[model samples]
Target: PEVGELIEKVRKAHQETFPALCQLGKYTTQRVSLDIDLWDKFSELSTKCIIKTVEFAKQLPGFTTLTIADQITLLKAACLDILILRICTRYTPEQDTMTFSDGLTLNRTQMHNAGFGPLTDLVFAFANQLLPLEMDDAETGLLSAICLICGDRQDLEQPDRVDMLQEPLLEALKVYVRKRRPSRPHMFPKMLMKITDLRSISAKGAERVITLKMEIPGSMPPLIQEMLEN
Candidate 1:
């Protein structure tokens, strides 16, 4: 029964959103005087998305076996990586821009000034690398779940149990990807490697979060602040 539900659980989490997913939107380089509020609201929206992502992680079978501390640790360790994957998925290559959950579209420079700063290029690089994989929502979602549920994070109480949990998800992902792309068997291995790239980018993302907090003190939501602090 549990094995049968892995894909379903992933599907459910991938599609879950606040009311609806953000649509492709338009904005420009020039500051609108509301830049601070807009970016603040984006942070708030991202905080909500992070909560939903945690819920997604909790739904994976065997995830609950770990202690509560371990669960939070895993979430804290992978939250930005998860957000990076989620945000990058919303990238619009045709426009050379990215959108937030609230439909705020900004180019690289605007993103840099808005909060991303020096991290924008790395983010875009990851996004560019991901395009060749041509991952769908399900693939991206399950990969994200895998990232969050891995046993390798420090402070995990039951690392072996977490590994056990991760194996089945990995298998499910492999099976699903193979089914979807029988012609490109190598894609699976490449996608797995991207997880490593994700970790590197997420480290930069964490730095950006700290800088953004200093740039706009008291603006980061308490939940996100907690995640960053952890």
Candidate 2:
């Protein structure tokens, strides 16, 4: 399923999620790294996790078709569960080949090839990982907002942005935009990126603080700048 351009979706999230980040820079220190086997056990477990997440998603009943409020609830769990799916698909802790040099300083290409490309550089500079916080409806709303905006997740691109917001998503989106618009622009598309980055990094934050960095691809859409400016 992963097959399209996903840089935009990821970039939008990166911009807002970080308190401070650089395009390309070395960590101030040794760059805290984590060690994980990329070989076997994790490979097995991650696959199982992804399969289970889908099964769980399917069981969520009309979570795919419900009143807006209920829909939000379904999406909340579904997406995070999907995150489990993504992580499961991404790496296995038990796999010997699954190596992340936790706290290890990495170059841009290395980060991108390994995944987490959108966050490579800036995240590395400020701190390796994000600081944590609990998300309320508003916070969840942000995450939900990004999911909808993601127009290209299936392409295998980690996503710089997505169009999770649409006419159907308007109500929930409008409220979320109201909360986020002050700092960012007031448009649905613009805010979509902002909130997604805010929430995506929230997950990273839980892992603890460290330095990370990534190269900003030159191929980004010009509309991206306009959206942020709006």
Candidate 3:
């Protein structure tokens, strides 16, 4: 009962405050053929998502307790990871394509040219691996929250405080996963393992950003610039 109540609190905190997952046509997906324009649109979309996600993170119970700088640090560290998972959830495996939150669907090559480039393979690999877990939206949201709350970021002023906030969210995820599918005893751990995969992808994502900076010069938006730089 205590566990369920705690899970409910986190769940309510997330659901009541965080924006819902983007619908089929909510965002305007871009074609990579737009060249610098493609990066332009991508940066706009990503920057907006980052801002909204930061707001959502603030609503989490322990998030406000962290100093403002630490909050920014956590968000910056995990924003790409959140974005990667969000986009991955939109994967359409049957078509071997991934859909952006906006209705546009891009194949491997389009995704490559769209900025994923060398990181495409790893991103898709993680997406495909995620398919079998079949996590619903709540799981995805909570996981994203957990990812942001992690204490391991290098610049956190209070790593232990961040770590403490993460514990209950982690427990809630475990309980929620087990309750959702009692038969799949391993689902929680498997889902946790995906975070490692996400980290690997996010690392490459940073590399992609570096390549883009060199390739496109000043195409990235200010918010995205902050996300990458800080």
Q: Which candidate number has the best TM-score?
A: 1
Query: CA shift at 31, candidate 2, in angstroms?
Result: 8.2
Q: Rate the local accuracy (lDDT) of all candidates.
A: 0.74, 0.33, 0.75
C-alpha lDDT (0 to 100) for residue 163 of candidate 1? 84
Clashing residue pairs for model 1? none
What stretches of model 3 exceed 4 Å from their correct place?
1-23, 26-34, 221-230
How does residue 135 of candidate 2 score in lDDT? 23
For 1-230, candidate 1 gives per-residue lDDT tens digits of 66547887776777764222244454543533236755766677687888777767766666656777878788878888888888887777877677776576777666655666567788888888887888876788779888988888988888887888788888878888888899988889899889999999888787777777776778665573344344
lDDT, candidate 2, 9-47, per-residue tens: 322332232111122232311122322221123223333
Task: For candidate 3, write residues 1-230 as lDDT tens digits.
Answer: 77676666656654554433344554334335335555566666676667667667766777878887887788878979988987787777877776654466667777766778668788888888888988776788788888989999998999999999899889889889988899977999999888998998998888878777777767554463344333
- For residue 161, what is the lDDT in candidate 2? 22
Instruction: Tell how far residue 112 is off in model 3, in angstroms.
Output: 1.1
RMSD of each: 3.7, 16.2, 3.7
Residue 181 C-alpha lDDT in model 3: 90
Between 1 and 3, whose TM-score is larger?
1
